[PDB]
DNA sequence: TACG
DNA sequence: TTACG
């Protein structure tokens, strides 16, 4: 159960023109604000009153209203414009406030295949009773990448969890860590553990297997 | 000019928590004050506001009857009283203020609020050992967030990927912190990972070797 | 001149008692500021034409109408808007909850500056009933609500209307008095007035 | 607000062996069930009591419990084993019931880039005030396929909605429809309308355009 | 045939109420568990409520407590889910399910659609997606109908190969919109004639529209 | 002396005081009792434990499990603490407490697999039960007999209580001081029986 | 409504 | 403070 949406994504390169739309069906006000958020920071007010620039916002930002549709436009994307953007629904005095789903403008780059590594469990963790097998997908593009765990060539699902880093500032890649967890008992009833990575950069999906304790 | 949120932290389902938001550098006078929240990896969810001049309040549906926003002109501080908290109330709670009744031009940095049955616990760090290159540290089974991972106390930064934590089915968090380095340096230079979990005051440095 | 909170009986005949009630600060100052800006931008203001002899003229004010039934004045018929702005619905409801009177119609006037006005009239339509209760909520610059009593076949009352003030007219006021908002000779900022009424089929 | 999630996805070929894991940590009971659902049909029960095969379920379905982890194993898939699989968590008498997130098992295929077609709005529709521009991505694999709208080379977002067909029985491909909607005024303010498609089987973005009035 | 039939579904304003019934045929609802489980479009199963029919003990999901009531009538072999103050997010297919266990649901009804919305029932507008240039692609845009569902056939049912009818989408206006497409050898454009047939039974509206090039 | 009807029974009044037992047939409805029997058989961590009598190490003719934060020693053997109560057992605990006014912090579970399983004559009079303990007994499965005999004074009254599926028995007052009880072996076939005895254990 |  | 059926 979740109260919000994950931000949607938009791929763009420096110099592109971007217009995000915010539908507000049957609204009757232009009291609309637009915000910007970068990872780990609080939002910043970009636009108030549908079209008014907040102080310190560059002039390449503009806000517009057509009918019940509101728009935020960046005329030519600068490198510091890659962030998540939010639209605040028409806010009537005395009434609640509603943020739309965020739009996350990530930067386009060349396809870049991941360097894949697999890590067996430490002996410390096995002593404790559990086994974590990590599979790392390092510095790749684009974001879409399917990791598939196999144990004695049985495809696993529901015993692994993954996490993705934010797009890297220097080289515009992503990284992914998937972690498969078993009991020590369950770990020792099998021999070969393999993560199979599927990505655009890769000809054919790669696999990084290992046999237990070698 | 700043807003400071405080009073967050850890409580169990059904428990109570009272967040505070202090204004410094300016004064909340005729301002509208809002509490917005953001769950990890998710979007902003406005939860409440007060018109400080009149005391009028508004609340989000997901939250009405359980939360109460208030302010003290006397102490230049706003408050969010959160009762009957449930797991999905877990988020970074932002305080924000408004010249307008809606346009939030100043925001605090946010307090984290975690709602779970789990009890404060430091992590166990396990090596991710380089093979026949990349290595790292598995920061496993801690609670609540956050956790800090540096490498070689700070000397090592280039090439490091510290991942967002994952919430395991046990209600405990697990992340991993990896580095890619030249294979040649494996035998030579030492790689220690430095793991701080301030909520339990656990500091752990683990050396990582093939 | 009447400018303090209170209930004032300004005449008692020929139709009956004419009573007006003044409540300054009914809407708090910051909310009144915010209401003024939002209604200035969100109300579908138009400058409409009246007809007095055989000629058509532009009214020296912007106007808008809300409610299921229409308002026809100066051969101007304001098409009824069913969709009330939420802020206007809230203000309607507050006036109703504290005063005990109900409304189904709202006229909105924007006096852009000192050159805008409304001329002498009474609110004595057949669609508004005989002893009509009318509520007036003001925002923006103070302007003067002037009243003059009709002679039988000259009594005057002045009511300054400031930011956030609620005025109620009831009793014989529309039968026995006329009112206007005059032009001014020094600069005025915009004023929004909300007049809530009951319109009948 | 969303009460549940959309099913996770596992890609497998016929005859592969699949073990879906359902985590129920801190649990102290083996009253666990497994269900299968196919598009448009109601779920049917497969495993009850963690490991007991339901009356008339194929024997290739297995279920077992190790510690607090429950597993549903298909020994080797067959064409009608591709469906969504839900784990009903440990059900304690007198307590609520909870279904886990579904796991959608889909057929693997060779990568197939999408066929891209763009449809300008009908004249019928514009004679009523709205312009709907459709872009079809036909018979592709895998499911992931981004679509970016451009209007006079301005990147759009927030003003379009898309939909994906279920996996086709025989060619094992997916198809996608995206609709960009504008007012007639907005639409007639601009000349070039394009849908730009990226996909695993596309080394570059494929763009399909039309100029208003041609 | 040990069937199970749901009644009482359909459309209601937010804040309104429905009473779902589940008629038990074939078998008996004597000493079993009756569950109500819902599924929002594209999402996983969400258990709503259950009753132990012998004692009348009931359990409810937190999302639903205080607003729904499950009950049983042994006399008529009929279960009931009274749903009050419905919110938009209660919109789902509601299933009725029975078990001899307290949790393992072996029998399922086919479920009725419950739509909680402020929109009013409305038949679709049908616009053509006229074929232009590419391998021949054409279709119909079934826009601005309410509520779900809608049926689309091609040429009264003869043309079915190459047909993709896409899942509908809920627009910001509250109305649904979908697309159906078919790919065609471009040589038939001159000869063969193509018509989409649209049934919207909630509006009792049937529309055939012919799709030709311009 | 045979008690098989719902009721409050003062089975003796001396020498220590009133011994009181209360019988509630059908405390758990029949279908729920069936389901509880299945779940507790399947889920409870049953073990056959070894006792020691006069240097003799014996397997108890029953499976047992313990719940509660405080250990439990009888017949010279110690059942270690299980603070994580099965949720069904916690629920049944709460129902018993609300419908009786008595509180509990300990649960002993006995599973009698068939007619050869049993428990021998004893009283539940540990010092860790306190003075005049209150004990609640909830039974599931096949009917078995709870036999009681009154302890004689320094130098015999008897009661048989059949315990059927879903029946709650309460013992309070002087019952453990003045009586012993057992569940005997039977000679005809028996299906499994689960008994839950809720008790208060002290530090 | 044309008046400041 | 279990070996019986
Ligand atoms: O503006 C005011 O205070 C009063 N307005 C009216 O009476 C009107 O427009 O008819
Ligand atoms: O099994 C029963 O009914 C009674 N059991 C006990 O009294 C016990 O184990 O100490
Ligand atoms: Mn008037
Ligand atoms: Mn005993």
Asked whether residue C158 is domain-assigned, the answer is yes
Nearest C-alpha neighbor of B47 from the set B19, B11, B27, B26: B19
Residue F112 annotated as binding? Answer: yes
Which one of B27, B28, B29, B30 would you mutate to disrupt binding with C, by most C Cβ within 10 Å of its Cβ? B30
Distance C122 CA to ligand 3 centre (A): 6
How many structural domains comprise chain C? 1
Tokens matching residue C128: 């508004």
Distance CA B65, CA B79 (A): 16
Distance CA D17, CA A157 (A): 12
Q: Cβ of residue F76 near strand H, that is under 7 Å? A: yes
Distance CA E145, CA E174 (A): 9
Q: Classify residue B152 by its DSSP letter.
A: G
Distance CA F175, CA F157 (A): 13
Tell me the CA–C1' distance in angstroms for D64 and H4. 38
> Cβ–Cβ contacts within 10 Å for residue B100, how many?
21
Number of A to D CB contacts under 8 A, please give it. Answer: 103
Residue B75 CB-density burial (10 A; 0-12 exposed, 13-18 middle, 19+ buried): exposed
Distance CA E148, CA E115 (A): 8
Question: Nearest 5°: CA angle at B142, between B138 and B145?
Answer: 105
Q: Which residues have a Cβ under 8 Å from the Cβ of A208 and sit 6 or more positions away?
A: A116, A117, A118, A135, A194, A195, A197
Asked whether residue C1 is domain-assigned, the answer is no
Q: Cβ of residue F195 near strand H, that is under 7 Å? A: no
Distance CA D21, CA D10 (A): 12
Distance CA B93, CA B78 (A): 13
Q: Cβ of residue C185 near strand G, that is under 7 Å? A: yes
Nearest C-alpha neighbor of F86 from the set D88, D97, D24, D27: D27
Distance CA C176, CA C12 (A): 9
Q: For chain F, list the contacting chains (3+ Cβ pairs, <8 Å).
A: D, E
All structural domains of chain E, each given as residue ranges with its CATH number in brackets, are 4-116 (2.60.40.10), 125-210 (2.60.40.10)
Distance CA E186, CA E213 (A): 11
Q: Are strands E78-83 and F144-150 parallel, antiparallel or unpaired?
A: unpaired
Tokens matching residue E97: 């399910």
Q: Does A117 touch chain C (CB under 8 A)?
A: no
Tokens matching residue E183: 């790919």
Q: Looking up tokens 């038949």, which residue turns up?
A: E123
Sign of the Cα torsion C35, C36, C40, C44 reads positive
Across C158-178, b (16+ Cβ under 10 Å) vs e yields ebebbbbbbbbbbbbbbbbbb
Tell me the DSSP string of A1-25.
-BSSPPPEEEEE-TT-EEEEEEE-T
Interchain proximity D31–F32, CB inside 8 Å: no
Q: Find the nucleotide nearest F183 (Cα to C1′).
A: H4
User: Could you identify the residue whose CA is nearest to the C1' atom of nucleotide G2?
Assistant: C57
Cβ contact C31:C163 at 8 Å: no
Asked whether residue C120 is domain-assigned, the answer is yes
Nearest C-alpha neighbor of D18 from the set D49, D65, D63: D63
Q: What is the CATH number of the domain that holds F30?
A: 2.60.120.590
Tokens matching residue C72: 């026809």
Distance CA E140, CA E198 (A): 9
- Resolution rounded to one decimal, in angstroms: 2.7
Beta strands in A69-205 (DSSP E): 69-74, 84-88, 103-107, 115-119, 130-140, 146-151, 154-157, 160-164, 174-183, 192-198
Cβ contact B32:B71 at 8 Å: no
- The H or E element spanning position E188 is helix E188-191
Cβ contact E178:E188 at 8 Å: no
Q: Using alpha carbons only, how large is chain C's radius of gyration in Å?
A: 16
Which strand H nucleotides have any atom less than 7 A from protein CB atoms? 1-5
Distance CA C138, CA C145 (A): 11
Cβ contact D179:D132 at 8 Å: yes
Asked whether residue F1 is domain-assigned, the answer is no
Distance CA E182, CA E136 (A): 8
| Binding site as annotated, residues of C | 45, 71-73, 109-111, 121, 123-124, 179, 191-197
| CA-based nearest distance A33→chain E, Å | 19
Q: Which residues have a Cβ under 8 Å from the Cβ of D117 and sit 6 or more positions away?
A: D135, D136, D138, D208, E132, E134, E137
Strand order of the β-sheet with D44-48 is D8-12, D103-107, D84-88, D33-37, D44-48, D52-53
Distance CA D166, CA D172 (A): 9
Beta strands in F42-143 (DSSP E): 47-53, 56-67, 72-74, 77-79, 106-112, 119-122, 135-141
Q: Range of C31's domain?
A: 6-197
Asked whether residue F38 is domain-assigned, the answer is yes
What is residue A214's three-state secondary structure?
coil
Tokens matching residue F196: 């839950």
D53-61: Cβ within 8 A, 24+ apart:
D54/E104, D54/E106, D55/E106, D61/D34
Interchain proximity E52–F31, CB inside 8 Å: yes
Distance CA F90, CA F94 (A): 6
Q: Which residues have a Cβ under 8 Å from the Cβ of E161 and sit 6 or more positions away?
A: none
What is residue F90's three-state secondary structure?
helix
All structural domains of chain D, each given as residue ranges with its CATH number in brackets, are 8-107 (2.60.40.10), 115-211 (2.60.40.10)
Distance CA D99, CA E38 (A): 11
Cβ contact C187:C113 at 8 Å: yes
Distance CA A12, CA A167 (A): 13
Tokens matching residue F99: 């419908």
Nearest C-alpha neighbor of D158 from the set A19, E11, C174: A19
* Residue of the CA atom closest to atom 3 of ligand 2: F195
Tell me the DSSP string of chain D.
-BSS-PPEEEEE-TT-EEEEEEE-TT------EEEEE-TTS--EEEEETTTEEPTT--TTEEEEEETTEEEEEESS--GGG-SEEEEE----TTS---B---EEEEE----BPPEEEEEPPPHHHHTTTEEEEEEEEEEEBSS-EEEEEEETTEEEESSEEEEEPPPPTTT--EEEEEEEEEEHHHHHT--EEEEEEEETT-SS-EEEEEES--
Which one of E62, E89, E172, E176 would you mutate to disrupt binding with A, by most A Cβ within 10 Å of its Cβ? E172
Tell me the DSSP string of D142-175.
SS-EEEEEEETTEEEESSEEEEEPPPPTTT--EE
Q: Using alpha carbons only, how large is chain A's radius of gyration in Å?
A: 23
| HEC-encoded secondary structure of A137-177 | EEEEECCCCEEEEEECCEEEECCEEEEECCCCCCCCCEEEE
Alpha helices in chain F (DSSP H): 30-43, 87-98, 175-178
List gaps in chain A by the residue before each (C–N > 2.5 Å): none
């Amino acid at each position: 159960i979740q109260m919000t949406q994950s931000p949607s994504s938009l791929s763009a390169s420096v110099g592109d023109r971007v217009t995000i739309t915010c539908r507000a069906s049957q609204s009757v006000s232009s009291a609309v604000a637009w915000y910007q958020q970068k990872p780990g920071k609080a939002p910043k007010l970009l636009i108030y009153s549908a079209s008014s620039l907040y102080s310190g916002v560059p002039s390449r930002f503009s806000g517009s209203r057509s009918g019940t549709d509101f728009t935020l436009t960046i005329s030519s994307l600068q490198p510091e414009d890659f962030a998540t953007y939010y639209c605040q629904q028409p806010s009537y005095i005395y009434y609640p406030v509603t943020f739309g789903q965020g739009t996350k403008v990530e930067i386009k780059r060349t396809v870049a295949a991941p360097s894949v590594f697999i890590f067996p469990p430490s002996d410390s963790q096995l002593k404790s009773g559990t086994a974590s097998v990590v599979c790392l997908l390092n510095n790749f593009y684009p974001r879409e990448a399917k990791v598939q765990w196999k144990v004695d060539n049985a495809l696993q699902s529901g015993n692994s969890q993954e996490s993705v880093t934010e797009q890297d500032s220097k080289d515009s890649t992503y990284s992914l860590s998937s972690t498969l967890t078993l009991s020590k008992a369950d770990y020792e009833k099998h021999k070969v553990y393999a993560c199979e990575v599927t990505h655009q950069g890769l000809s054919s999906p790669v696999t990084k297997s290992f046999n237990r304790g070698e | 000019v700043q807003l400071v949120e405080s009073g967050g932290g850890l409580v169990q389902p059904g428990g109570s928590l009272r967040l505070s938001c202090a204004a410094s550098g300016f004064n909340f006078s005729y301002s509208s004050i809002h509490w917005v929240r953001q769950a990890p990896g998710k979007g902003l969810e406005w939860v409440a506001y007060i018109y400080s001049s009149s005391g009028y309040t508004s609340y989000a549906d997901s939250v009405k009857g359980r939360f109460t926003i208030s302010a003290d002109t006397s102490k230049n501080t706003a408050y969010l009283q959160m009762n009957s908290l449930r797991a999905e109330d877990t988020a970074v709670y932002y305080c924000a203020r408004g010249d307008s009744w809606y346009a939030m031009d100043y925001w605090g940095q946010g307090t984290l609020v975690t709602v779970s049955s789990a009890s404060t616990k430091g992590p166990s760090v396990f090596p991710l050992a380089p093979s026949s290159a990349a290595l790292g540290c598995l920061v496993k089974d801690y609670f609540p967030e956050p956790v800090t991972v540096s490498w070689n106390s700070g000397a090592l930064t280039s090439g490091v990927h510290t991942f967002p934590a994952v919430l395991q089915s046990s209600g405990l968090y697990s992340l991993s912190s990896v580095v890619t380095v030249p294979s040649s340096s494996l035998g030579t230079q030492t790689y220690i990972c430095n793991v701080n979990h301030k909520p339990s005051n656990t500091k752990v440095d683990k050396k990582v070797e093939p | 001149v009447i400018d303090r909170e209170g209930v004032y009986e300004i005449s008692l005949s020929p139709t009956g008692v004419s009573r007006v009630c003044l409540y300054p600060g009914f809407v708090d100052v910051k909310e009144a500021d915010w209401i003024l800006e939002q209604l200035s931008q969100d109300v579908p203001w138009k400058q409409r034409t009246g007809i007095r002899e055989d000629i058509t003229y532009q009214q020296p004010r912007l106007t808008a109408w809300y409610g299921e039934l229409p308002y026809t004045y100066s051969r101007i018929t304001m098409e009824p808007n069913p969709h009330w702005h939420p802020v206007l619905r809230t203000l309607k409801n507050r006036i109703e909850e504290n005063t005990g009177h109900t409304f189904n119609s709202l006229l909105c006037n924007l006096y852009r500056n000192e050159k805008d006005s409304v001329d002498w009239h009474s609110d004595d339509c057949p669609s508004l009933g005989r002893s009509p209760i009318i509520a007036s909520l003001s925002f923006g610059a103070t302007r003067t609500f002037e009243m003059r009593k009709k002679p039988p076949p000259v009594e005057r009352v002045k009511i300054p209307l400031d930011h956030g003030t609620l005025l109620i007219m009831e009793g014989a006021t529309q039968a026995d008095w006329q009112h206007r908002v005059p032009k001014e000779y020094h600069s005025r900022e915009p004023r929004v007035n909300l007049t809530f009424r009951t319109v009948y089929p």
